[PDB]
Every structure is written in C-alpha cells, then in structure tokens.
C-alpha cells in the first residue's frame, strides 16, 4: 500500500499564487499520472485536471499540472487565486497495473 504525502493546511492572500505538492510514498511522480480533486461543503467533487495534463473548458485554467524528471514529487501552480479558489484540495494517482489511489488531503483557505 502506497500514500501521498502533501502540505497539511495553508491560507493565502487573495491573488497570490498557490502551488500544490503530492507525494507518493513510492517516489513515483513523474512516471505516474495526477489528478486534482477539488471538495466543499454545499457542493460536490469536480475534477479540475486529469492525466496532470487535461485541462477542461469549464474550470478555470488557472490550475498547472506539471512534474519534475527528478521522480520525487508532482508539482501544481495555481496563478489567479481568490475567494473561488477556496476550498479543501485532493489529488489520485494510477501506474500502469491499475490500482487506484487516492489523497492528498490539503484545506487551502483564502484570508
């Protein structure tokens, strides 16, 4: 069994940038793909980003989906952060042999 270590909870000001980290307890990032979940209260789960590369039409852009050759950790900037970029974080993560995974539990709060 594999876990994703990422930031624990942060805030800040609105219209700073924001970059995520997720981790895998294997160290396999750049060869695997990312996704990010984005969850609240008075809503539901809606993927902004999918294969850490898809972006949709319909949610702002302002996510990145990026990784490092170095295979250590997938690294996201968000540029354009504001009170709708409030809400709690979570990211999945699947090699080759399936099995799915998921976590990256991070509360970004927008002061």
């Given at each position: 069994?594999?876990?994703?270590?990422?930031?624990?909870?942060?805030?800040?000001?609105?219209?700073?940038?924001?970059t995520?980290?997720?981790?895998?307890?294997?160290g396999?990032?750049?060869?695997?793909?990312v996704?990010?979940?984005?969850?609240?209260?008075?809503?539901?789960?809606?993927?902004?980003?999918y294969?850490?590369?898809?972006?949709?039409?319909?949610?702002?852009?302002?996510?990145?989906?990026?990784?490092?050759?170095?295979?250590?950790?997938?690294?996201?900037?968000?540029?354009?952060?504001?009170?709708?970029?409030?809400?709690?974080?979570?990211?999945?993560?699947?090699d080759?042999?399936?099995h799915?995974v998921?976590?990256?539990?991070?509360?970004?709060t927008?002061?």
């Amino acid at each position: 069994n594999f876990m994703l270590t990422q930031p624990h909870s942060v805030s800040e000001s609105p219209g700073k940038t924001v970059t995520i980290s997720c981790t895998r307890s294997s160290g396999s990032i750049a060869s695997n793909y990312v996704q990010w979940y984005q969850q609240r209260p008075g809503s539901s789960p809606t993927t902004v980003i999918y294969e850490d590369n898809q972006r949709p039409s319909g949610v702002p852009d302002r996510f990145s989906g990026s990784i490092d050759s170095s295979s250590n950790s997938a690294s996201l900037t968000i540029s354009g952060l504001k009170t709708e970029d409030e809400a709690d974080y979570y990211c999945q993560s699947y090699d080759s042999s399936n099995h799915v995974v998921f976590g990256g539990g991070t509360k970004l709060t927008v002061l």
